[PDB]
C-alpha cells in the first residue's frame, strides 16, 4: 500500500516505538514514569507547576514526538483527574499546555490523550529477539498502580495487530475485482476473515490482564476525556495556547482505524447516516493520525466490494463475504458480554446509552450479512 | 486528475446540465418547472399526492439521474416549506418519497436539496457559442417569482468556475514538490492566487443580480433544512422508505468541493481541532457528490504543501504561499461583509453565524507565515 504508515507486521501501531526522550526532557520523563507514585502522595500537580516550559524544537523525528505527545497526554490525565475521585483542575499549566498543543497540533492530533497514544505507541517488546507475545512485551505508562493497564492497552494492542495481519489482504481484494478474478477474490475475503477469527481469541486474554474493578473504578476515570462531561461542563482550558476552554473527547476503541477500516471495506456503513451511533465514530476519526484517516476515506474512494459481491450471485463469494462480515459480529458480540463484566456489573456494586450503541454498531453489522437470515 | 469528475473548463459543477427528462417523467418536470404558479396557486402540495409512483428506471445515465434529483430536490423543499410562511408537511407523499430516496441512493446523496443539486447542475447556456458569463446564462429551476434565485444560483456558481482555474494546477504543485522543482511549483502557486483573486472580482456581481429583501425573507427559506431546526424538529418521514423521521441539513456552499480544496492544500485545517467550524465542514463533505469528496479525500492523502514551504527557508515560495492564503482570506472577509448586508441587516428589520465564519476566515489568516 502506499505511505500510511501501515508497518507490515504491527499494521497500525507505531513500530518499535521510542522508550526515552532527549535528556532535554529529563523533567517531563520524570513525571510521566512516576505517575503513580506522585499522584497517590499528593504532590503531582505541584511537581508540573514546578517545571519549565521545554520547547519542542528537540523533538527531531516522528517517533520522538509521539513519545513526546503520549508523556504529555498521560502527564495531563493525571493532572485534570488528580486521585480520580472528584478534585478536578479544569486549568493546565502553560508550562504543560503549551509544548503539548504545539506538538499536537503538529502530529494533527488534538491535546489529548488517544488510543494512538496509550495503545499504539504505548509498548515495548521485553526481549527484541522473541515475537510480539504477551509475556515478551510491556507497557511505558501508567496512571496507578493496580490500574491494569499494562493489560488494557496490551490486549488490545495484541487484539489491532492480529486484526493488522488482513490488512495487507485488502489490496489483492481490489486487485480481484478489478481484473475480476473470483478464485482470489474467494479466499482473499476467506483469509480476512481468518484474521478477524484469529483476533477474537487473542480477545479472551484480557479476562487474565484486566479486573473489573481495577478498570471501571481506576483505569477509566483517567481515559476520560472532557466532552459533554460535568466535571469540566465547558472543557478545559490550556493556558498560554487557547483563551477559551476546548472541549475534546476521552481516549476510546472507536480511534482505532482497524476496527473501522472493515466495516468501510465491507460496504457495512457505521458511519451513514445522521445517527449517535454514525457520528460518534465519524468524529473519532478525528482522534486518529492524520495518515490513518486518510486511510479510511481512501478505502471509501474504492468501489464497494459488498455490490460486486451481490452481483455475481456466486454462493461460494456470498459465504465467503459473510465469513468477514460474520466475525466482525463475533467480535462485537463477544465483547458485549465483556463491556457487561467489566463496566455493567461493576456499576452496580457501588449507562444504557453504551449499550444501544453497542448494540446498535453490532445491529448494522448483522444486517450486513447476506445469507443466514 | 483522472475521473473524479472534473470538467476542464467548468471544475466540479456538471458540464452542460441536461435540460429535460424523458417523457415518462412529464409529470415529474411539469411541478419542477411551475413551482411559482402552484405554490402561489397552493395547488402544489395536491398535484404532489396525486401523482404516482414514477420508477428511477428510466433514468439511464448521469446526467438524467442529476437534473431527476435537482427536479424531485426543488419538488420536496416546496412540499416541505410550502407558500414559506412557518406551515410545514412533515410527511414526504410515499409516491415522491421513495424515487426520491432511491435515486439518492444510486448517487451516494441525502435525499435533500444540496450545493451540487440547485448550482451545480442548475444552469444553462443561452447562445451555446457565447463564453460562460452572467448575460448568457440562466438557471433551470426557481422556487418563488422574485427569489432572485436565477442571481444567486449563478454568481455562486460563476465563482465556482473562477475558481476551477487552479484546480489545473493541484498536480503541478504536488509534481513540483516530489521532482523538487522549486520554480516551477512558486509560479505554480502563484497561478493559483492569481485565479482566487479573480474569484474575489467575480464574487462583485452578487450585489446586482440578488437582492436583500428577497433572500433572507423568501429564498433562504426555501434553501432551509430540517436538522437542528426546531419547524421539523425530529425531522422528515419519508414516507415508505423509513418508519422515522430523518434529519437532513439544508442547502450551503459549504457543501462546494473547490472551496474545501483550497484550504486542505495550503494546510489550512477548518476540518481539524475540533471546533464547531470543523465538524460541519467535515460533515458537509457527504452532502457532496462521490467523486468530490473522493478527490478531496485523496488531496489530504498527499504531502501537505504548506509544509514543503516552511522546511526549505525560501522567502520567494513562502510570499508565494501566502499569496494564495491572503486570497483565502480576503475572499472569506468580503463574504463576511455580504452576510452582514443579506442576513443580519435583513434580521434587524443569528450571532452564532458568523461566528463560525469570523473561526474560519481567522484559521485562514492563522496560516499566514509571515
Ligand atoms: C475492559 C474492557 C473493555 C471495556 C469495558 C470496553 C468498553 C467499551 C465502551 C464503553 C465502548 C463505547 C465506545 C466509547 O465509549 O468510546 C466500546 C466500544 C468499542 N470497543 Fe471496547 N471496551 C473494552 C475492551 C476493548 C478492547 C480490548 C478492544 C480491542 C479491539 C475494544 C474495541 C472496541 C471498539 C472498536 C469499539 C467501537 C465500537 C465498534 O467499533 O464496534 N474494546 N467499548
Ligand atoms: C447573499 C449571499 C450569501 C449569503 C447570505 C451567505 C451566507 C453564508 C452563511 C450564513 C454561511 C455559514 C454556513 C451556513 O450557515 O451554511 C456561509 C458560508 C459559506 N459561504 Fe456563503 N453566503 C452567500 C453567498 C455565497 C456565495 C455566492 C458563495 C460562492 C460559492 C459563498 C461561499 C460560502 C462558503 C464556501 C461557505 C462555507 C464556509 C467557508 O468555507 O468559508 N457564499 N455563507
Ligand atoms: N481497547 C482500548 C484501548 C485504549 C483505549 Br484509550 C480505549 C480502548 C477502548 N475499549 N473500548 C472502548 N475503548
Ligand atoms: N468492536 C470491534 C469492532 C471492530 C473490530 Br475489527 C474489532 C472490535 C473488537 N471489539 N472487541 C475486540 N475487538
Ligand atoms: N451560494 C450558495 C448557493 C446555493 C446554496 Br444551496 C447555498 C449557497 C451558500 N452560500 N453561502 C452559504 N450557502
Ligand atoms: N467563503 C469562501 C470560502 C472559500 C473560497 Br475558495 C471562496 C469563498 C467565497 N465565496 N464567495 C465569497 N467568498
Same mark, same amino acid.
Given at each position: 500500500?502506499?505511505?500510511?504508515?501501515?508497518?507490515?507486521?504491527? @499494521?497500525?501501531?507505531?513500530?518499535?516505538?521510542?522508550?526515552? =526522550?532527549?535528556?532535554?526532557?529529563?523533567?517531563?520523563?520524570?513525571?510521566?514514569?512516576?505517575?503513580?507514585?506522585?499522584?497517590?502522595? @499528593?504532590?503531582?500537580?505541584?511537581?508540573?507547576?514546578?517545571?519549565?516550559?521545554?520547547? #519542542?524544537?528537540?523533538?527531531?523525528?516522528?517517533?520522538?514526538?509521539?513519545?513526546?505527545?503520549?508523556?504529555?497526554?498521560?502527564?495531563?490525565?493525571?493532572?485534570?483527574?488528580?486521585?480520580?475521585?472528584?478534585?478536578?483542575?479544569?486549568?493546565?499549566?502553560?508550562?504543560?499546555?503549551?509544548?503539548?498543543?504545539?506538538?499536537?497540533?503538529? =502530529?494533527?492530533?488534538?491535546?489529548?490523550?488517544?488510543?494512538?497514544?496509550?495503545?499504539?505507541?504505548?509498548?515495548?517488546?521485553?526481549?527484541?529477539?522473541?515475537?510480539?507475545?504477551?509475556?515478551?512485551?510491556?507497557?511505558?505508562?501508567?496512571?496507578?498502580?493496580?490500574?491494569?493497564?499494562? @493489560?488494557?492497552?496490551?490486549?488490545?494492542?495484541?487484539?489491532?495487530?492480529?486484526?493488522?495481519?488482513?490488512?495487507?489482504?485488502?489490496?489483492?481484494?481490489?486487485?480481484?475485482?478489478?481484473?475480476?478474478?473470483?478464485?482470489?477474490?474467494?479466499?482473499?475475503?476467506?483469509?480476512?476473515?481468518?484474521?478477524?477469527?484469529?483476533?477474537?481469541?487473542?480477545?479472551?486474554?484480557?479476562?487474565?490482564?484486566?479486573?473489573?474493578?481495577?478498570?471501571?473504578?481506576?483505569?477509566? #476515570?483517567?481515559?476520560?476525556?472532557?466532552?459533554?462531561?460535568?466535571?469540566?461542563?465547558?472543557?478545559?482550558?490550556?493556558?498560554?495556547?487557547?483563551?477559551?476552554?476546548?472541549?475534546?473527547?476521552?481516549?476510546?476503541?472507536?480511534?482505532?482505524?482497524?476496527?473501522?477500516?472493515?466495516?468501510?471495506?465491507?460496504?457495512?456503513?457505521?458511519?451513514?447516516?445522521?445517527?449517535?451511533?454514525?457520528?460518534?465514530?465519524?468524529?473519532?476519526?478525528?482522534?486518529?493520525?492524520?495518515?490513518?484517516?486518510?486511510?479510511?476515506?481512501?478505502?471509501?474512494?474504492?468501489?464497494?466490494?459488498?455490490?460486486?459481491?451481490?452481483?455475481?450471485?456466486?454462493?461460494?463469494?456470498?459465504?465467503?463475504?459473510?465469513?468477514?462480515?460474520?466475525?466482525?459480529?463475533?467480535?462485537?458480540?463477544?465483547?458485549?458480554? #465483556?463491556?457487561?463484566?467489566? #463496566?455493567?456489573?461493576?456499576?452496580?456494586?457501588?449507562?444504557?446509552?453504551?449499550?444501544?450503541?453497542?448494540?446498535?454498531?453490532?445491529?448494522?453489522?448483522?444486517?450486513?450479512?447476506?445469507?443466514? @437470515?
Amino acid at each position: 500500500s502506499k505511505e500510511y504508515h501501515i508497518d507490515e507486521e504491527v @499494521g497500525f501501531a507505531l513500530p518499535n516505538p521510542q522508550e526515552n =526522550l532527549p535528556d532535554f526532557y529529563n523533567d517531563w520523563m520524570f513525571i510521566a514514569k512516576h505517575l503513580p507514585d506522585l499522584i497517590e502522595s @499528593g504532590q503531582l500537580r505541584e511537581r508540573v507547576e514546578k517545571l519549565n516550559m521545554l520547547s #519542542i524544537d528537540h523533538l527531531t523525528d516522528h517517533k520522538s514526538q509521539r513519545l513526546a505527545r503520549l508523556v504529555l497526554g498521560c502527564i495531563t490525565m493525571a493532572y485534570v483527574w488528580g486521585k480520580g475521585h472528584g478534585d478536578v483542575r479544569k486549568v493546565l499549566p502553560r508550562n504543560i499546555a503549551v509544548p503539548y498543543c504545539q506538538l499536537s497540533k503538529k =502530529l494533527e492530533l488534538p491535546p489529548i490523550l488517544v488510543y494512538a497514544d496509550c495503545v499504539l505507541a504505548n509498548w515495548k517488546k521485553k526481549d527484541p529477539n522473541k515475537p510480539l507475545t504477551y509475556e515478551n512485551m510491556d507497557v511505558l505508562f501508567s496512571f496507578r498502580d493496580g490500574d491494569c493497564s499494562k @493489560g488494557f492497552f496490551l490486549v488490545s494492542l495484541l487484539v489491532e495487530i492480529a486484526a493488522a495481519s488482513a490488512i495487507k489482504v485488502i489490496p489483492t481484494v481490489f486487485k480481484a475485482m478489478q481484473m475480476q478474478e473470483r478464485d482470489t477474490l474467494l479466499k482473499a475475503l476467506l483469509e480476512i476473515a481468518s484474521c478477524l477469527e484469529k483476533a477474537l481469541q487473542v480477545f479472551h486474554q484480557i479476562h487474565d490482564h484486566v479486573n473489573p474493578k481495577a478498570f471501571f473504578s481506576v483505569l477509566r #476515570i483517567y481515559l476520560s476525556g472532557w466532552k459533554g462531561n460535568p466535571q469540566l461542563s465547558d472543557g478545559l482550558v490550556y493556558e498560554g495556547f487557547w483563551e477559551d476552554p476546548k472541549e475534546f473527547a476521552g481516549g476510546s476503541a472507536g480511534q482505532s482505524s482497524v476496527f473501522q477500516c472493515f466495516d468501510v471495506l465491507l460496504g457495512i456503513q457505521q458511519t451513514a447516516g445522521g445517527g449517535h451511533a454514525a457520528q460518534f465514530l465519524q468524529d473519532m476519526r478525528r482522534y486518529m493520525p492524520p495518515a490513518h484517516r486518510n486511510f479510511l476515506c481512501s478505502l471509501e474512494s474504492n468501489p464497494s466490494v459488498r455490490e460486486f459481491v451481490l452481483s455475481k450471485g456466486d454462493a461460494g463469494l456470498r459465504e465467503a463475504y459473510d465469513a468477514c462480515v460474520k466475525a466482525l459480529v463475533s467480535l462485537r458480540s463477544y465483547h458485549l458480554q #465483556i463491556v457487561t463484566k467489566y #463496566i455493567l456489573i461493576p456499576a452496580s456494586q457501588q449507562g444504557t446509552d453504551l449499550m444501544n450503541f453497542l448494540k446498535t454498531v453490532r445491529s448494522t453489522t448483522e444486517k450486513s450479512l447476506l445469507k443466514e @437470515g
